[PDB]
Amino acid sequence: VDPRIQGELEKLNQSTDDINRRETELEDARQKFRSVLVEATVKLDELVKKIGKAVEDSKPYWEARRVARQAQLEAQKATQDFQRATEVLRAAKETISLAEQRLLEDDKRQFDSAWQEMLNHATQRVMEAEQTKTRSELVHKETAARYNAAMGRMRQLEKKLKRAINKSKPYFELKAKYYVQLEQLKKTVDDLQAKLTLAKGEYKMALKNLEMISDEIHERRRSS
Amino acid sequence: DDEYDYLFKVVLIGDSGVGKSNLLSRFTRNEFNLESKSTIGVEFATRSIQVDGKTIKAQIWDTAGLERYRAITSAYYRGAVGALLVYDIAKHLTYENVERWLKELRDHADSNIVIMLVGNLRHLRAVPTDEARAFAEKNGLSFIETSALDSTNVEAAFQTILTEIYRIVSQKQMSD
């Protein structure tokens, strides 16, 4: 008679409607993205026309502010890494032998690697924890210096371009807003695209197991 | 290659003695490698065109003419937006059973689908073209007859029914 045909058929003509629905939603999302981008460009352009040339030559300042924020974030991450490195160090020192502790701390003049053969073997993990800690402190101070450089730079550029920056604030503020909205709508478009592709995948799969049923009937009829 | 804008379901119905598979085989890219009518009961085949700037991918569900054990007709007609009722211009029994197949459509398909009646060298005129044309006119259906050597009007038929379906769905979308 017939086995599993009806269920996969129903799944197929359901995945049709699912595909059409997801596609319509995706196209509406694309349209909203387009109209928002157009509106953004024309509004920003007219704001440039009514604000003047301050926006253009005040552009290096806002760039210096961007690199300053990045140097800040990178500095924070490096400070975190330093902290966790330090806790690893002290937790390693919890292997006590307090005499050996200040043997490492008091002077690394001539550690003489042959002493490790004579004392606790758990000094190696302590010592390499000290190494990773000292390097993490290096990157910590380095990124701190980068942050201070970017900060002072953006401030002297600020005092060089004070009038232009204050006159150009609304353009860059509105442009920021439009950019946020654009990335949100683009996220929506991408997610709807993924839903659509998944629906088409379900369709293709139901079709594939349907012709799988047909092929299983092929060899069954081939037995003769 | 799944890049398209709409997906429309079109069913192929009518009397079995018309041989729809050979007019289909010219334009349809069968998705399976073996006959799906004797095994599954329906033979799928997909065709894509372009209408009004958008891409229309329509999948054709073929036959189920051996309806001796086809309790799958509920799923076979569900969701379909297009229907092709194919009869032979050399047989009158097919043209008489067109009413029966229309009953099957009204019983199992949606009440807003686009239906088109299609009429398919040695035999001479059994169905007058004007009679079938007036029949499709009184029943609110499209109509185009075509043979297998000059298959222009079947392509124009596909583009016609698909274009009408796109018109319906676009008019539905323009009322949001």
Numbering used by the authors:
A (entry chain C): 41 to 264
B (entry chain A): 5 to 124, 128 to 183
What do the study authors state?
Rab GTPases act as molecular switches and cycle between a GDP “off” state and a GTP-bound “on” state. The Rab11 proteins are master regulators of the surface expression of receptors. The mammalian ortholog of REI-1, SH3-binding protein 5 (SH3BP5), also has GEF activity toward Rab11 and was shown to be selective for Rab11 over Rab526. Detailed biochemical studies reveal that SH3BP5 is highly selective for Rab11 isoforms, with no activity toward any of the most evolutionarily similar Rab GTPases.
To understand the molecular basis of how SH3BP5 mediates Rab11A nucleotide exchange, we determined the structure of the N-terminal GEF domain of SH3BP5 bound to full-length Q70L Rab11A to a final resolution of 3.1 Å. The Q70L construct of Rab11 was used for structural studies as the marginally increased GEF rate for Q70L vs. WT suggested Q70L might form a slightly more stable complex with SH3BP5. The structure is composed of four complexes of SH3BP5-Rab11A per asymmetric unit, with each of the copies in the asymmetric unit sharing an overall similar architecture. The GEF domain of SH3BP5 is composed of a coiled coil that is kinked to form an overall v-shape. The v is composed of four long α-helices (α1–α4), with a small helix connecting helices α2 α3. Nucleotide-free Rab11A was bound to the GEF domain of SH3BP5 at one end of the v at a surface composed of the N terminus of helix α1 and the C terminus of helix α4 of the coiled coil. The SH3BP5-Rab11 interface is composed of a large extended, primarily hydrophobic interface (~1250 Å2). Comparison of the structure of nucleotide-free Rab11A bound to SH3BP5 compared with Rab11A bound to either GDP or GTP reveals an extensive rearrangement of switch I41, with only limited conformational changes in switch II. The main difference is in the conformation of F36 and I44 in Rab11. These residues pack directly against each other, which requires a constrained conformation of switch I. This constrained orientation of the highly conserved F36 and I44 residues is unique compared with previously solved Rab-GEF structures.
